């Protein structure tokens, strides 16, 4: 009888653990829904064509300043390639303004498919040894990772 009641208590504990695990899994599922919605919004952001160019210029400036390399080779999606080709030497001028350095000899070819890119640029350096992945999908999942505690704090009830 003692071991029967002990096994019954163990079964009750296992049921409680299963219930709490189901609750936690539903929480994670809601977080995944949030991530999917954020990805959809990020994809929708690519529809713009005027502030989108400014954002691309800012991204390329940030990446080139982070590498600080003599010769990068930027890679951009075939879609909106015209925007990158248009911004062109503006980024080089901005970088040369940032510090007293000769303008980088950028090179722009192969492009990854749209959904893989979803905006943003990959800059890298000659021989591809050092790679900077400033894709919009890459900026996301880092902001998400950092802000996740704030997300849980927002999910009080």
């Amino acid at each position: 009888e003692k071991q029967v009641e002990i096994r019954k208590k163990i079964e009750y504990s296992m049921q409680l653990n299963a219930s709490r695990i189901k609750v936690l899994q539903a929480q994670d599922d809601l977080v995944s829904n949030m991530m999917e919605a954020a990805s959809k919004e990020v994809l929708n952001v690519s529809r713009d064509h005027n502030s989108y160019k400014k954002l691309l210029k800012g991204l390329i400036v940030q990446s080139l300043l982070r590498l600080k390399e003599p010769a990068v080779l930027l890679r951009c999606r075939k879609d909106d390639h015209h925007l990158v080709e248009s911004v062109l030497e503006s980024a080089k001028e901005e970088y040369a303004q940032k510090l007293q350095v000769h303008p980088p000899e950028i090179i722009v070819h192969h492009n990854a498919h749209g959904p893989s890119c979803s905006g943003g640029v990959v800059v890298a350096s000659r021989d591809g040894k050092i790679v900077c992945e400033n894709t919009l999908d890459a900026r996301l999942d880092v902001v998400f990772r950092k802000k996740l505690p704030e997300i849980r704090k927002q999910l009080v009830s």
Binding site: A38, E41, V45, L55, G58, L59, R139, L140, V143, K147
Partner: peptide, 13 residues
Amino acid sequence: DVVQMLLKHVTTV
């Protein structure tokens, strides 16, 4: 609101 905050952080340089 969460998605707006996320996009605001992502879309600023």
